[PDB]
């Protein structure tokens, strides 16, 4: 009944637990994880229809009232993020069936997979700050182990780096929760939002909001807090990397979004001009890194950084059109970055090399993969029949309506430069004569990538279907009074 909201959290959790008992039986690992992920997708779709039909769904964990126990809240944005997470998880799991070798999946691989999706799905639906802390460490601990699993020298080194950074940011989130508890005295989102709005003219709230910016920008890579991410994402294997690029940096973006649309609304001018300048720096760093490299993984990594910057710039304007555009761009960018890492993995499987300058002439031997990557590149850029057009269109329109000409031109030129990076991959890798590779039949793993591509194309065609969910999400984001009268009954 009303526990439907926990079915994105409970279903992978149970699954991860029962995958501990039989490590050496890889067939039943695959069967149980596949069936549970399909059930996760079905339950998340049912939750999205539930939050669409009647109102926002709130569940107290015990029978305890709203300030005093843990409350889980699913609005329409969190349900959309859960469904997007479920689709990405299913595609990455089937790619994991074809891609991960035998030895790495005898040692608890699918358990760690399910714990990572537990962490992200719990992070998108929570109503407490410290519970959100705990879900961040579930997510981060599973990401540490998935990064290090296999134990070659490269992933040892960058697991040390990645672990060091996330320990520092975890301690910083602890001290931020401590400061905010000393000011307010509560721990759930809605009641401390009410308490912050009861004393909104104090400077310490601005200082703690800037501290949350620093923490969540260490989580999802903002300038000047991005520096850990290139080597850390250059380390892991391909489906693990698709999980990381699809999911990990985008929960920091959602946390920034929830923080500045729910908690900190008084004295908005300083916080929003800070977000604007950090977002502009993030976009510039991302497009410079995308132009600079002749290496596929680095190109997709800096495209992650650039798209995060565009989303943060959409957050930095308190207009419903900009919020609508960054929600559209958020969903399609999660799906698209997971898709592009799976493409890069297939191309590396063919070429036995990651250098763009080493190989050419893949259209003459792999036409479906080539034209799929062509459509994926043009959908990443923002060409209008494809997915990522209406998001940046609404962002550009909301920036022109608020008199930001230069920043809108920065967004459009960033779209140009990210198109140049991915089309550099396409034109130097797929076109040309044949010199770099040897004919090797790919199998199986192409189909989850094609499934993601078909869903992205159908997303770009069918904006009118997927829009009223985003409209209810915008109606709850730009008005937190409905959020705090839904929880605090």
């Amino acid at each position: 009944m009303s526990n439907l909201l926990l079915l994105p959290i409970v279903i992978p959790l149970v699954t991860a637990i029962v995958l501990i008992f039989f490590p050496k039986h890889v067939f039943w690992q695959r069967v149980v994880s596949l069936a549970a992920t399909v059930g996760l997708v079905v339950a998340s779709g049912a939750l999205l229809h539930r939050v669409h039909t009647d109102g926002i769904q709130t569940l107290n964990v015990g029978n305890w009232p709203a300030p005093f126990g843990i409350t889980l809240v699913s609005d329409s944005l969190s349900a959309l993020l859960v469904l997007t997470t479920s689709i990405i998880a299913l595609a990455c799991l089937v790619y994991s069936f074809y891609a991960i070798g035998h030895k790495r999946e005898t040692f608890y691989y699918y358990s760690f997979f399910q714990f990572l999706i537990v962490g992200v799905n719990g992070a998108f639906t929570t109503g407490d700050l410290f519970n959100l802390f705990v879900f961040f460490e579930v997510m981060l601990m599973s990401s540490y182990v998935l990064l290090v699993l296999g134990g070659t020298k490269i992933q040892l080194r960058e697991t040390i780096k990645y672990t060091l950074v996330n320990v520092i940011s975890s301690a910083l989130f602890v001290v931020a929760v401590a400061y905010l508890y000393a000011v307010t005295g509560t721990l759930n989102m809605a009641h401390l939002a009410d308490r912050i709005n009861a004393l909104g003219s104090s400077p310490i709230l601005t200082v703690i909001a800037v501290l949350f910016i620093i923490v969540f920008g260490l989580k999802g890579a903002i300038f000047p807090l991005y520096f850990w991410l290139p080597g850390a994402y250059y380390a892991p294997p391909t489906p693990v990397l698709a999980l990381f690029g699809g999911l990990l940096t985008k929960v920091g973006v959602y946390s920034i979004l929830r923080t500045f649309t729910l908690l900190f609304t008084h004295d908005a001018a300083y916080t929003h001009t800070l977000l604007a300048w950090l977002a502009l720096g993030t976009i510039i760093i991302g497009v410079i890194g995308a132009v600079a490299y002749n290496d596929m993984r680095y190109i997709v990594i800096y495209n992650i950084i650039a798209a995060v910057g565009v989303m943060i710039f959409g957050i930095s304007i308190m207009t419903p059109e900009s919020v609508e555009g960054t929600i559209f761009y958020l969903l399609q960018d999660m799906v698209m970055k997971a898709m592009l890492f799976l493409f890069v993995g297939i191309i590396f499987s063919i070429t036995r090399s990651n250098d763009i300058r080493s190989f050419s002439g893949l259209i003459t031997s792999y036409p479906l993969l080539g034209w799929a990557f062509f459509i994926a590149a043009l959908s990443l850029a923002g060409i209008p029949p494809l997915s990522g057009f209406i998001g940046k269109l609404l962002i550009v329109k909301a920036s022109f309506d608020a008199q930001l000409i230069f920043e809108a031109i920065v967004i459009l030129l960033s779209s140009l430069l990210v198109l140049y990076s991915v089309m550099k991959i396409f034109m130097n890798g797929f076109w040309g004569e044949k010199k770099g590779f040897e004919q090797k039949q790919v199998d199986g793993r192409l189909f989850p990538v094609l499934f993601l591509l078909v869903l992205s194309v159908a997303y770009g065609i069918g904006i009118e279907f997927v829009r009223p969910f985003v409209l209810d999400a915008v109606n709850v984001l730009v008005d937190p009074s409905m959020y705090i009268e839904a929880v605090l009954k």
């Binding site: 959790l13 290090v148 520092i168 509560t186 029949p385 140009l416």
Partner: protein, 788 residues
């Protein structure tokens, strides 16, 4: 509505092409592509009766109705002119490509898929009434043209040309999108025909929309300085060159300028920007077109020059909107001139490309210095080339007479509003001189001279008739609008002028009696005679001023600047990431810590930080003082320790004394768990110590760097002062009266830390159990799995 299945029919047939291509192996696939443009052309002949008697055709297909986006379609005179051009020259280029390409040596299904995507995209560009739909069709045009230029992907220069054309036209298209969005905010709506009936100059977003739309429209139609991509798009197949770079894509910016002229030509920035950049690229391409040594580069710079002519006439036709002195109304003539030469250019330019394509695969070369006497070898294509070149030069019996005399008539009557504009026609005049030169040189170094029986290929150079069909039809249409200019004017060209100059015709008889005007002694006649005589006396002496012309053409170009600009951009970005991304973790920690300190201290210093209330503070007691002195001693001996065991045992002492604080601040559970966890963790540190490698170990002290010490003191004092500011301000109390009031009355417990951990907030204890489980499984996986 029957036009919805006309706009989206080339896309469906582009879906169906490879089916017919690999399932019908006998018949050439282009024949199956052949009827559809024919059908569209015949369908587009069905609207002329409704457009002559000033009636328009409107259609709507909604796409996102809540974001207020549709595929609108609006059909009037200008859109019919462009649609008839697209479909007629499309069917002719399809026929020429049937007879040009081969069957068992060429991928043909790719060719006709790309071409038919381009045709559907261009028909969508022209017919569109919605701005976002227009931008969508614009982008599809750019992508399909990018595909068509690189048709031979196994050769380098095609990929260079496709990359450069892609980057330039995408840059223009994105700034075009920004201008469209600014215009749609300036007006209330998105549809073009409702932006006309509303005022837009009293709005701040009018000039940025003007500059961005104008920037994209100059980028598409190869204006100055953006003409750079069009001479390198000549590595395409010859039907691609003919169709795209004669009639369809290079006129899209022309269509946008002519379409939005009733909105933006009320300002002077639009009309003078358009006119001046048209004159500049006319003269610049007319100068540069005589340097080249192959046919297609000459025709590419020719295309750039006549596009500049058309857009300069569009600028003077924008000057028509302000005022006309006492019913003179002369500037409207410029509009007609533009539209006439627009239509005119398409026809002969298409034929000329087809001509050079023929002679290419009838000789093997296309350079000007190997092919000589081809008059009595190839008479029919010589006739077609002579007709096209004399029409391009601007000579009396062919089309170029009316085009050039209306051009000089429009330019001479436009200098009578400002004195500096007296500079403008004579500059344009020498452009025509330059024009004649290359056109004369074209024919006079293609077919004249003598035959070379040693380098050439074939004893018989007789061309097939099927290749020759479409240039004959284009040359016949050239001759027909030459000798009979009245019927095509009164049928097509007049409602185009009534479209471009909307809301301005209070009478309509002056335009009609100027269309019916053909002869009468004009002062522009001896101007054309002087063009002819000076081009004749300039061409005969051309091997004398040849070196001066070659070195002055070397003296200024624009591909040098673009190539070095991209080398600069990639090298600067690469040196940026080689500077700031060093790889050392110490440096990135310095950047993160410094940014943390800077943002927090600036946020504190920006405010005034009032209301320091020391009344919350508790009374200090001696035991906490002595224990604080103890853990300060352990902290100081763990930062200044020479060996690492000393830092390990000092971290242990810090842990046990934090446990003693937990005892002393009334926290028993914290003390128990803290003692056990610190004993286990210190055992793990001693595990990590004694397996250090014996080489390069050396047991050295902590190295002192001044920046690390400054950053560390700033971090500590920053979080200290934030803790003091937060703890001693205004506050709401807490929510723990409920937990001390309902631990036993509602739950079953007397302990309160444990009841919070398992009953009130027990939902997060489950996931810290999960964190410990992941940690143990990960330690097992790291130790046991050693695949390397």
């Amino acid at each position: 509505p029957t036009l919805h299945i006309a706009m989206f029919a080339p896309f469906l047939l582009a879906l169906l092409v490879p089916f017919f291509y690999k399932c019908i192996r006998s018949l050439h696939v282009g024949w199956f592509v052949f009827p559809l443009p024919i059908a569209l052309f015949v369908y587009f002949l069905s609207y002329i009766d409704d457009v002559r008697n000033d009636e328009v055709i409107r259609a709507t297909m909604p796409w996102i109705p809540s974001l207020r986006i549709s595929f609108d379609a609006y059909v009037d005179g200008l859109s019919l002119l462009f649609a008839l051009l697209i479909t007629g020259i499309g069917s002719l280029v399809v026929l020429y490509s049937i007879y040009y390409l081969q069957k068992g040596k060429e991928p043909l299904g790719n060719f006709y898929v790309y071409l038919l995507l381009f045709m559907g995209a261009m028909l969508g560009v022209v017919l569109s009434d919605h701005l976002i739909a227009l931008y969508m069709f614009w982008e599809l045009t750019s992508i399909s043209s990018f595909l068509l230029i690189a048709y031979w992907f196994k050769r380098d220069r095609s990929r260079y040309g496709a990359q450069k054309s892609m980057l330039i036209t995408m840059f223009g298209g994105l700034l075009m999108l920004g201008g469209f969005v600014a215009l749609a905010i300036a007006g209330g709506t998105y549809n073009i025909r409702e932006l006309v009936h509303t005022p837009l100059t009293e709005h701040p977003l009018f000039i940025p929309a003007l500059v961005l739309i104008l920037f994209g429209a100059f980028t598409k139609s190869a204006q100055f300085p953006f003409y750079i991509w069009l001479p390198d798009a000549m590595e395409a197949p010859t039907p691609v060159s003919a169709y795209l770079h004669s009639a369809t894509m290079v006129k899209a910016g022309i269509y946008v300028i002519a379409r939005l002229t009733p909105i933006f030509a009320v300002s002077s920035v639009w009309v003078w920007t358009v006119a001046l950049v048209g004159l500049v690229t006319l003269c610049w391409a007319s100068f540069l077109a005589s340097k080249q040594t192959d046919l297609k580069a000459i025709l590419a710079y020719s295309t750039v020059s006549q596009l500049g002519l058309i857009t300069s006439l569009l600028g003077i036709g924008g000057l028509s909107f302000h005022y006309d002195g006492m019913g003179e109304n002369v500037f409207m003539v410029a509009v007609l001139a533009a539209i006439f030469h627009l239509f005119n250019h398409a026809t002969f330019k298409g034929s000329l490309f087809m001509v050079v394509g023929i002679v290419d695969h009838e000789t093997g070369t296309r350079d000007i210095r190997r092919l000589g006497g081809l008059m009595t070898i190839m008479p029919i294509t010589f006739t077609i080339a002579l007709i096209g070149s004399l029409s391009m030069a601007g000579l009396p019996p062919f089309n170029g007479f009316l085009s050039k005399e209306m051009f000089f008539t429009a330019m001479l009557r436009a200098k009578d509003v400002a004195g500096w504009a007296v500079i403008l026609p004579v500059v344009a005049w020498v452009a025509s001189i330059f024009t004649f030169l290359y056109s004369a040189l074209l024919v006079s170094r293609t077919f004249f001279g003598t035959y070379k029986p040693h380098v050439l290929k074939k004893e018989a150079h007789e061309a097939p008739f099927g290749m020759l069909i479409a240039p004959i039809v284009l040359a016949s249409l050239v001759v027909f609008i030459g000798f009979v200019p009245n019927v095509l004017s009164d049928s097509v060209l007049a409602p185009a002028v009534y479209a471009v100059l909307y809301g301005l015709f209070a009478p309509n008889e002056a335009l009609d009696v100027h269309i019916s005007h053909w002869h009468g002694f004009t002062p522009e006649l001896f101007m054309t005679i002087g063009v002819l005589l000076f081009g004749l006396v300039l061409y005969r002496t051309f091997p004398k001023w040849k070196k001066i012309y070659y070195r002055l053409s070397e003296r200024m170009s624009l591909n040098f600047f673009y190539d070095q600009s991209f080398v600069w951009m990639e090298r600067g970005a690469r040196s940026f990431i080689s500077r700031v991304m060093n790889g050392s973790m110490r440096t990135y920690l310095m950047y993160i810590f410094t940014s943390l300190v800077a943002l927090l201290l600036f946020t504190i210093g920006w405010h005034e930080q009032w209301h320091i209330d020391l009344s919350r503070l508790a009374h200090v007691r001696v035991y906490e003082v002595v224990l604080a002195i103890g853990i300060l001693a352990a902290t100081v001996t763990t930062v200044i320790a020479k060996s690492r065991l000393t830092a390990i045992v000092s971290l242990g002492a810090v842990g046990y004394a934090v446990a003693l604080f937990f005892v002393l601040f009334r926290a028993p559970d914290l003390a128990l768990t803290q003692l056990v966890i610190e004993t286990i963790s210190v055992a793990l540190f001693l595990l990590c110590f004694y397996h250090l490698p014996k080489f390069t170990q050396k047991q050295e002290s902590v190295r002192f760097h001044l920046g690390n010490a400054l950053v560390s003191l700033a971090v500590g004092m920053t979080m200290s002062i934030i803790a003091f500011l937060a703890y001693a301000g205004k506050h709401f109390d807490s929510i723990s009266q409920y937990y001390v009031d309902n631990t036993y009355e509602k739950a079953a417990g007397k302990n309160m830390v444990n009841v919070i951990l398992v009953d009130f907030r027990g939902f997060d204890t489950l996931f810290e159990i999960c964190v410990l489980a992941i940690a143990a499984l990960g330690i097992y996986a790291m130790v046991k799995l050693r695949l390397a």
